[PDB]
Amino acid sequence: LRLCQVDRCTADMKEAKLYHRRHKVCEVHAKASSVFLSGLNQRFCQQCSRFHDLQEFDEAKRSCRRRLAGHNERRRKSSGE
Ligand SMILES: [Zn+2]
Ligand SMILES: [Zn+2]
Numbered sequence: 001l002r003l004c005q006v007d008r009c010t011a012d013m014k015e016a017k018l019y020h021r022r023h024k025v026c027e028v029h030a031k032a033s034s035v036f037l038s039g040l041n042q043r044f045c046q047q048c049s050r051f052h053d054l055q056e057f058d059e060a061k062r063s064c065r066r067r068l069a070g071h072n073e074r075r076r077k078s079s080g081e
Helices: 018-022
Strands: 036-037 040-044 051-053
Touching: none
Parallel strands: none
Antiparallel strands: 036 040, 040 051
16 A cells, blocks of 8 residues: 655555554654655654654654753743833
């Protein structure tokens, strides 16, 4: 079944799980070392289960920046009149 978003993919999903068949992804692509998508390097994100570019990933952790990294409260504007 050829239902993988990744182009130039030659993986056979004749017998895959509902987690790989539903999301339309390969087990090898799910936890691969940066796939070649649209020419650029795009890795998987177990956080959102979607696909994110490499520029978005950072640090030893290969996950999304949101939540993982931590935006923290912090302040921007001040109170006054
Ligand atoms: Zn694939
Ligand atoms: Zn994500």
